[PDB]
Structure formats: C-alpha cells, structure tokens
Amino acid sequence: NTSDMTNPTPAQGQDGARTLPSKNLVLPLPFFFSRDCGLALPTVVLPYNEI
C-alpha cells in the first residue's frame, strides 16, 4: 500500500507504461511470545519438542 504498487497502470502502448516495481516486504507474525517481552519460548527448557 505504498501508493506505488496499488496504482493502476495501463498497457505499455498507453500513456501509463510504468512497470510495477519488485521489492522486499516484511510482515511481522503476531504470536503469543511475540505479543509481550515477558512471554518468551524457553527453548533451553524444551529439549523434547520441535517447534
């Protein structure tokens, strides 16, 4: 929603021939441990479970 990737572009033969740029986007994952710093996964305490 950077006002550039959502702007309509006509075909190459029309006035608007700009190509949609390719770039990197980041999405944080809201999890129970990510919500607060006081809640963190004890990987040292869990040596029998694969996450």
């Binding site: 990987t43 869990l46 040596p47 029998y48 479970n49 694969e50 996450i51």
Partner: protein
C-alpha cells in the same frame, strides 16, 4: 496288495539344496547393527554445550 514306498528323486539332494550361510550371517550382522540406537530422542535440543 502292499503300500507303495516313496523316496527322493533320482538326482541327489545336496547339489540342488546346497549350503552357504552367507545370507544368514548377513542378516545377523544387519540385525546386530540395527540393535544400536540410530534415532535422536532430543529434538529441538542443540546439544552443543557453551564454550
């Protein structure tokens, strides 16, 4: 008037049946090798102690 007597074929048995224990020794060696544990019972561990 008499019960017929049945025996083995004309050809000797040993030439066909033969005797070579290589297969059974291979099976025993494979079983002994598989007796030792080969899987990991500590997933999500990272068993490298701190330096």
């Amino acid at each position: 008037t008499v019960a017929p007597e049945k025996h083995g074929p004309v050809e000797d048995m040993n030439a066909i049946i033969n005797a070579l224990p290589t297969k059974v020794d291979a099976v025993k060696l494979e079983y002994s090798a598989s007796k030792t544990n080969r899987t990991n019972k500590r997933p999500g561990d990272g068993g490298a102690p701190p330096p």
